[PDB]
């Protein structure tokens, strides 16, 4: 990703545009990561509360 040293030339509305573009490559790790994020949508299983 830093083959053209583009890590220093990105403004705040370009990295926000990447997180909203729907394109995912399904694999074993993504099928194992999205299940891990589903178990943390309450934060009480993360020892964090309000």
């Amino acid at each position: 990703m830093n083959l053209s040293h583009s890590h220093n030339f990105i403004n705040i509305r370009d990295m926000m545009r990447w997180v909203m573009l729907p394109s995912l490559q399904p694999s074993l790790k993504l099928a194992l990561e999205e299940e891990a994020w589903a178990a943390a949508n309450d934060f009480e299983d993360l020892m964090l509360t309000d």
Binding site: N2, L3, S4, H5, N8, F9, L28, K29, L32
Partner: protein, 95 residues
């Protein structure tokens, strides 16, 4: 091995001058891009943030992607975790 390189007539047969390759033009093309932006920023009064222009090793990068294919996110184990423990107190038959 290929049907198109069989050179029968001596028209296309000529002298070899130099050579080129894939992993050599990949490091050459990134040099000629980063040398140009380091040349016009030395001849004129430019005012930007200091960004170093180092040419990365491409062959080391492509090897390290290939080593990531041998990773294993799972693991083989004989027994599961402990997952539960008990604290004793002065009481018997109640913990």
């Amino acid at each position: 091995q290929r049907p198109e390189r069989i050179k029968t007539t001596p028209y296309l047969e000529g002298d070899v001058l130099s050579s080129d390759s894939g992993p050599l033009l990949s490091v050459f093309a990134l040099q000629e891009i980063m040398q140009k932006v380091r040349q016009v920023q030395a001849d004129y009064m430019t005012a930007t943030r200091e960004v170093d222009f180092t040419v990365p090793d491409v062959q080391k990068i492509l090897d390290d992607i290939k080593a990531l294919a041998a990773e294993q996110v799972y693991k083989i184990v004989k027994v599961p975790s402990i997952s539960f423990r008990h604290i004793v107190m002065q009481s018997r038959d109640r913990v």
